[model samples]
Target: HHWGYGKHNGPEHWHKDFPIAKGERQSPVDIDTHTAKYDPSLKPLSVSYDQATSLRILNNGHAFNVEFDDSQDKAVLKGGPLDGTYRLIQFHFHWGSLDGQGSEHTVDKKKYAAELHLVHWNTKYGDFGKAVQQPDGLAVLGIFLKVGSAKPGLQKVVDVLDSIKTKGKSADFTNFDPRGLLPESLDYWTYPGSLTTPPLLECVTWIVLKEPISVSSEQVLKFRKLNFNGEGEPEELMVDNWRPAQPLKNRQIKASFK
Candidate 1:
């Protein structure tokens, strides 16, 4: 009720309620390769996941997220700009109403068809809820989605969308290894930013992969069928759920490759 991606309640008005929207380290900033510093010392990302940790998939009005069981250390992200182990908690996506305008982060002002966020929290913080409020708490791995061949690994996720087509609806989604969705290269752009949603906490250390995963046009359209409204509410299509790129300010973007 407080915020959403609409004419009145969209990002522009978010700062009015959540002041962090104007914070120095806000997310989804435009990445300019020419200005990015290439660091050879950046370690390759180490991601260990257990298929059994996948718990459920839900339509949270904004996006459909596949939640994970992080009670144990079965799934974790190490290395790459991260100083410690960060447990994978969930993953979701953002897309446009049309084909090529959904991704939040951009490269030289170019937007992709969509973006996928794998949200993780630092184990040092104890839990995700508390991690969201700390500077070094969250690490979100962003993967770009391009229109092409249908991604086989993602088919399992797409199969469940029909069941959770309405807001607040969910279905069992287990034994799925999210690592299968990642690109072949672990090279990425690292930067300090915030969550692309409300509260816009300036705590996320974004690691956006250089390569994009391919999904067929038909498969991309499936995401549009999700409803923002619940079962009996006025039907509203869930699209254009991405935030516009924020100002870079004084932050420097680091690259894992030259």
Candidate 2:
């Protein structure tokens, strides 16, 4: 059966298909800032994105992803918990039906309207697939998005929604840079975690920013307009495409701030 956010195939049902769904280091854990250990060794995260590296945007039956040219390290993410180079691959979002609750990781049980996941893979391995099996293979930067004033540059992505409204639709989307979408601060919480989606691979070093950017409710409404169902399938609006916070287990959450 295909995995989705419906009652039948939602997060609670993931462990059946992907046994690792219940693994030791699963992602999107609820972050309790008071309990997070402040690490002095952690460096400030830095992101170098090449505007032209953006390839295209596509809906893959779940969330729409803006893929990048990972063939080279033009757009890169380094510092933070990482020691070397990690190339940007793609970036996507997760949200709820309404604004009250959405974001995958919460702060002290605090949820945001949505969350953005910028995925990167360590360049030491041959490529993304090869790196997926290793412990420190992938690094994901999580940025929370709160509903407030409209965010700059996000309209560029949302404006293209009409072209890729259904599942499996791909469109040419370029000349966009995500760096302008982050908040003023780069302080974050880092932990060893897995990809928030299925097969729910456990290979990512999650760097969740403490700051959140702003987006208008209208933009979120546009995201809700997307269809999860394909051309001929039963129609289902793509809403609540987010996984709940997982158990932290014995892992420690280190912060770049106190």
Candidate 3:
């Protein structure tokens, strides 16, 4: 009955509950490299993190999130289309039912195996909840994941999935530097968009990396095994949790690299 990736409650039906679902700046749009304008003025991204701020990881039914301590400036992101320092709140991912078709945002009409989102809230806004509704309040760094050699950094998180396999489950997760999961090239595409989930607030300034990190097929399948249900509930595999690409409308997608 609740919103999900199922036939009756999927993204196609989200507009009934969230009117912003039809907004002009909805996220996960197809990026046409031939058309995206290059902006040399964009500053290089500045990322600083304190491993101690990484508190825990949880399965919130929709996706597994690695939560952080944002009360202080221990971990912050700035520059590269961001006006102020944004505290790292949490990071999650979206994927498909199978390999080759999970990424929400596509490149030249092509889909990757998966995508990762590191969600942050502008410090000026105070908190993530309040930031979600304000323009320039939320900044999400998106990274594409492609099938290739195993990523050792990802294995650390994968090892904990068994501990939080079901919805509402969580476990102590710390001392991990998320930067290890990033690609060497910081080149990215920036645009104004909304959250890809319920409420779908039009506040996010999306910075999607042009390069993708590598992951093995086995690791991807492990993600597919995650469940949307909790203990004592009928099992439902968590897959294809990505929202389909929305219309580009009037927004211009800007690239950091020429």
Candidate 4:
């Protein structure tokens, strides 16, 4: 029921699978830069975790999202090039129930098979709800997943995907470090944009890493097998839960070292 750009999957057929509201921020398309402009103060923040964060998995009836609750001692990003020091809050992901595509940031208008979002917030704004409203209050690091040969940085995460298949179900994830999930290189492309979903908050400072991580074909398939629908649940099995791409809305995307 999830339709996207490309042949029968192109944008024209998107409305057929999802209502206009659901497709508002669909994934898998380029963030047009021609008309997008930038703010000189917008820059990357340094983030790192200090405590042993715990992972709580939730079956959202579409795909599994492993959320990290590191509210204890947290990672602090001081003002270096960035305007504020944000704490690493919770991080989650968006993926296709199928193996082929499900990420938010696309390169050259091309979609990746899956995507991960590491969400952070500037504590200077008090809390997430408050922070999400300010222009520099949020920073999301995006990683692209492509089906391939080598084991993935996500290997640590996928190991528990099935354990939390039921809604609200969780398991102990000691020594769970998110730093490992980061692409080998921190070099990234950044931009000032709004959230790709409802509430559609325009407070986000997006940092999408350029290099992609590789997952074996089997690994990708396992991620695809996740169904947000719980046992005996009424909602149809959510095979793909990606948002369509949105207009850059005159926002400029910048690359590190550019």
In model 4, how many backbone clashes occur? 14
Candidate 4: lDDT of 222?
A: 65
Let me know the TM-score candidate 3 reaches against the reference structure.
Answer: 0.97
State the RMSD for candidate 2.
1.0
TM-score per model over all chains? 0.98, 0.98, 0.97, 0.77
What's the number of clashes in each of the models? 0, 0, 0, 14
CA lDDT of every candidate: 0.92, 0.91, 0.91, 0.63
Model 4 Cα shift for residue 91 (angstroms): 2.1
lDDT of 4 by residue, 129-241 (tens): 88987888887778888877655556776778777665556666666677766667765667666565444566777777778877777877666655555666654434455
Q: After superposition, how far is residue 203 of candidate 4 from its true place, in Å?
A: 2.1
Runs off by more than 4 Å, candidate 4: 1-29, 32-45, 50-52, 77-81, 97-99
